[PDB]
Design a protein around this motif. Structure first.
Motif, PDB file in Angstrom:
ATOM      1  N   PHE A   1      -3.197   4.677  -9.002  1.00  0.00           N
ATOM      2  CA  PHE A   1      -2.998   4.282  -7.612  1.00  0.00           C
ATOM      3  C   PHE A   1      -4.312   3.952  -6.909  1.00  0.00           C
ATOM      4  O   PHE A   1      -4.388   4.057  -5.679  1.00  0.00           O
ATOM      5  CB  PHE A   1      -2.268   5.379  -6.828  1.00  0.00           C
ATOM      6  N   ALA A   2      -5.349   3.560  -7.654  1.00  0.00           N
ATOM      7  CA  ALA A   2      -6.651   3.314  -7.043  1.00  0.00           C
ATOM      8  C   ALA A   2      -6.622   2.087  -6.141  1.00  0.00           C
ATOM      9  O   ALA A   2      -7.088   2.132  -4.996  1.00  0.00           O
ATOM     10  CB  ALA A   2      -7.718   3.162  -8.127  1.00  0.00           C
ATOM     11  N   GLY A   3      -6.076   0.979  -6.637  1.00  0.00           N
ATOM     12  CA  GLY A   3      -6.021  -0.245  -5.863  1.00  0.00           C
ATOM     13  C   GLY A   3      -4.648  -0.519  -5.291  1.00  0.00           C
ATOM     14  O   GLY A   3      -4.227  -1.676  -5.190  1.00  0.00           O
ATOM     15  N   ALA A   4      -3.941   0.540  -4.906  1.00  0.00           N
ATOM     16  CA  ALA A   4      -2.570   0.425  -4.415  1.00  0.00           C
ATOM     17  C   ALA A   4      -2.578  -0.211  -3.031  1.00  0.00           C
ATOM     18  O   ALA A   4      -2.871   0.446  -2.032  1.00  0.00           O
ATOM     19  CB  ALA A   4      -1.902   1.795  -4.385  1.00  0.00           C
ATOM     20  N   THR A   5      -2.254  -1.497  -2.969  1.00  0.00           N
ATOM     21  CA  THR A   5      -2.106  -2.221  -1.714  1.00  0.00           C
ATOM     22  C   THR A   5      -0.719  -2.862  -1.680  1.00  0.00           C
ATOM     23  O   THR A   5       0.138  -2.585  -2.524  1.00  0.00           O
ATOM     24  CB  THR A   5      -3.211  -3.266  -1.539  1.00  0.00           C
ATOM     25  N   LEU A   6      -0.501  -3.729  -0.693  1.00  0.00           N
ATOM     26  CA  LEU A   6       0.809  -4.322  -0.475  1.00  0.00           C
ATOM     27  C   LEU A   6       0.816  -5.844  -0.532  1.00  0.00           C
ATOM     28  O   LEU A   6       1.890  -6.442  -0.402  1.00  0.00           O
ATOM     29  CB  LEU A   6       1.375  -3.864   0.876  1.00  0.00           C
ATOM     30  N   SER A   7      -0.333  -6.491  -0.719  1.00  0.00           N
ATOM     31  CA  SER A   7      -0.399  -7.949  -0.673  1.00  0.00           C
ATOM     32  C   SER A   7      -1.277  -8.499  -1.791  1.00  0.00           C
ATOM     33  O   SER A   7      -2.100  -9.393  -1.571  1.00  0.00           O
ATOM     34  CB  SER A   7      -0.900  -8.433   0.687  1.00  0.00           C
TER      35      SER A   7
END
Lengths: 404, 404, 385
Positions: A235-241
């Motif tokens: 979940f290190a680079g967990a973004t939405l876009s």
């Protein structure tokens, strides 16, 4: 908005496995995770509903020997953390917006397997219009937290509910009505939505007909389901876009540890596609869209009979997924509709000619604008492994839908 | 479902002949098989209803010299086996589902010869709708074992019986009501069957009127009778959804060993067609279908007088059968009545739009649809010798039935 | 019945303090416990009547400085347990039977303070018949849970309501009529109650005249009220048919920590007797019988004027109690004999002649030793007589 996303997913999984592993509930079955996950995030929004201790349907058995039984679980360790996150300043007030998205995506599996149309029937419109009835059954606080994600018809139902439920009533309606207008970009739709506010529903069938023509803006966000959250270790680079959700959830599919349940083994393809339907909030789209983007045909609900009871769902195989393209979420509406000389002085200059030579009708006029549209979407797509613009060329499964 | 079918038919026949051959009861007479078999069904489900020793009417006599008399027999050897099969794990819990199918079919001959309407009359409706009142007189355990085979009216009667019969009351009704809705696929019928759940039998005549229009889903399974089971020597490919049953009992007809009983020799054609009606559950099936499927005219009950008593039924001829077509068992209802885009995804798609712009009435509105439906069946009929799809083209006896 | 009671009071007591202590509501005021307990009891069966958050009248103040004000409370934490205890297998389905016992006993104080006769007035009978009209105002689920505890007049009122209001009508009335027959052991009364079944209420005044003579069977259960349950720290031997209840609530009196509220301090003896009147179901019972049992005089309602408004009830003193005898709860009718109006009057004379009251006998404090009630001085006076 996306700053607090990476930190949210890790602790959701931490409590998600805490309740299951305490009572030896394996997290490689979808049904165990979906029931546990529904219990896990229940304490976040509707705190007073779930019992501190209760028995639910889970798959008990080691190494494929799982079977339905009711297992009592102690939710109290998971209850305290959820309520403290409600007003924790670490979220910058984004806990309510984040929690609204979780309920909608996870309840999709129940809607897919149990095809129901509560909003449209309560709205007395065509049953093929749950397309804009997204976000039904969500908490009103969540419906005031991310009303944009909640479909207009649910708000229109809540607008209908508010008319069929006091100065505090207006405050709920203005959020309901205001986000109805934000979602529905139609110039004629906005005017007739305001007419829905007073309490009439005569053109609600016309609105039902208009929704067939004009597509209201529906904000989307890529959120994993309960089984994938417990089975996701990054979940290190967990973004939405970006492509992180597509890449990370593929890694869960690459692991092939999670298993899915169904009435019989024919549903292995159907239930695998439900993950793809629920993760990106892209359930009722064209199969050709799914075929091109995810490189595989998607089985419709008509191909299978009635879904068996959750008390008799059996593990039907592993979870698999593949994709070839992706894009940023649908922020604005996909269908976007966005020469004579008039000398203002007595003076002379050469004249160049750039040209050689009812409300329902107005609603149909705007409806006619969206029939002639040939390009939907906002900007472009991106191929797997990057953000290179790749426009959709066409597919043979276009105009065919999961519930269509 | 069909896994245990091959092993059940062989072992039932062993007890079928053991009881008859012990007391010199020939199995080439239908009445001897039926009365012996009527004893056989008792040991399976209602173990305490049949006396260990009793005299029953059979045909005693060698080489056509059979005469009517009461013969005492010993059923105890068959009793211990049957009770042990009730919870024997060899059936995978399919013993009750298998026993319910056998009980319904074997009582058809008594109903055909003694034309009675116990359910429709008790439901105060038209007597011509006993086709949907199938499964009467069956054990409640069997009626909870294969409620789908038991016709809705019997369940509707049992729903009426239960309203006219304590938290255990609901448990019986929920199975009764749930399988009422499953059998009757009418959207308006389902909403008005729930009226019957609370005792609103005002639309009970409407339900009878609807039943004449909407045909409820009745699950069917090809099960032989006692005269054929005792005369069948092959059960290797004994299944429930192919042409094996049609081919298996044709060989019994080819053997021409079984004899039938009746008031007089005019009933030889009528009684031969009773085997066709009972085995394939085609009592209510169109005679035009039946004449086309089985290549022979079916005699109606009006062509004959009152059936003589079982105490005076005499051998009237040899059993014969022929068929030219068949079909998969009717899983769903014979009459079945089964437009825009959902922008859940940001797809830039070619936008295509497929549009250019009283409760009894709803019941009658749904009633008209099944009137509009001319073709009957699920997929098609199949020809003898395989599963080659042969649609029913029509016959002189279309829209005609045995009791019509 | 009494098997779960030792543990089943504990969950009742658990929510009594959590709601009050969350908002710093002191539990040494009866009115604070009375309303809070009513809120807690409201969530038990009538789940939709109370509010998740609401303001009610309580006494706010530390160490005797309580000035009344309405206090908001978060009932939502206390709502979940009450509904979940209904079908919890730990209670073995006894939640409704005990809640019927609990709801009946906890509504006694308001009736005593504001002297009203709702059952008899709607039944058009003598207003003095306020002992056999037990179980009024209780939820119908509880009324079907302990219809024996609900007095015949309330059932008779429900029988009258059912005639002055579908296959479900019979099921409600058969319980109503059957428990009318069960409670009223009068053989002539039963057929005379059977006259009331289809509405022959010409003998309703006769039934009022009968109840003077024949005392219908009123089942009793020794269940504590809101202030005592919160103040009771022992429930190991908590049952319904022995001296445990008598011994348990005596210890609360010895603590002298609970305070009562009233219009003025003259009610301190009256309020103390109300606790005695409510625990053992002795509201409309002769005061002299209690005087021998409890070793103290009892004050009639005539000795005091109209009760002040709930918004002006003030703390008037500490709760005190004493007792010397007890008895097993009155299971059958206190009076036992083990023209149609003349037959009822003939049966009426069978119960006027009866002098001994109870089932077997009373018992002395400290055990179940059989002690018979000899008499008293302040008899002939009820709480309202």
């Amino acid at each position: 908005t996306e700053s607090q996303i990476p930190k949210m997913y890790e602790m959701i999984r931490d409590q998600m496995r805490t309740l299951a592993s305490t009572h030896k509930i394996p997290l490689n079955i979808d049904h165990n995770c979906e029931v546990i996950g529904s219990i896990i995030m229940a304490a976040c929004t509707n705190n007073r509903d779930l019992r501190p201790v209760d028995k639910y349907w889970f798959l008990m058995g080691p190494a494929g020997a799982e079977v339905m039984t009711e297992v009592e679980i102690d939710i109290q360790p998971q209850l305290q953390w959820a309520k403290g996150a409600v007003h924790d300043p670490k979220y910058k007030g984004q806990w309510y917006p984040f929690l609204a998205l979780l309920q909608i995506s996870n309840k999709t599996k129940d809607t897919i397997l149990w095809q129901k149309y509560p909003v449209t029937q309560e709205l007395e419109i065509s049953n093929s219009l749950e397309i804009y009835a997204n976000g039904h059954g969500i908490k009103d606080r969540l419906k005031n937290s991310r009303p944009r994600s909640v479909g207009p018809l649910v708000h229109l139902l809540h607008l209908k509910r508010l008319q069929e439920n006091s100065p505090a009533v207006n405050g709920i309606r203005k959020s309901i009505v205001g986000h109805l207008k934000r979602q529905c970009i139609g110039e004629t739709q906005k005017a007739m939505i305001n007419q829905f506010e007073m309490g009439r529903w005569e053109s609600l069938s016309t609105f039902a007909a208009s929704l067939l023509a004009i597509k209201p803006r529906i904000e989307n966000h890529f959120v994993l389901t309960y089984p994938l959250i417990a089975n996701c270790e990054d979940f290190a680079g967990a973004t939405l876009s970006d492509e992180w959700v597509f890449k990370a959830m593929e890694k869960i599919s690459n692991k092939k540890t999670l298993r899915v349940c169904g009435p019989d083994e024919k549903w292995i393809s159907f239930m695998n596609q439900i993950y793809i339907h629920s993760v990106f909030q892209t359930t009722g789209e064209d199969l050709g869209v799914l075929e091109w983007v995810f490189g595989g045909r998607f089985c419709q609900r008509k191909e299978f009979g009635r879904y068996c009871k959750k008390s008799q769902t059996k593990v039907i195989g592993l979870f698999t997924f593949q994709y070839e393209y992706w894009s940023k979420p649908l922020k604005s509406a996909p269908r976007s509709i966005e020469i004579s000389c008039r000398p203002s002085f007595k003076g002379k200059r050469p004249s160049y000619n750039n040209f050689t030579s009812s409300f329902y009708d107005q609603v149909r006029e705007e409806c006619q604008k969206y029939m002639d549209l040939k390009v939907e979407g906002t900007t472009c797509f991106y191929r797997k492994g990057g953000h290179v613009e790749v426009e959709f060329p066409g597919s043979a499964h276009c105009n065919t839908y999961l519930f269509g």
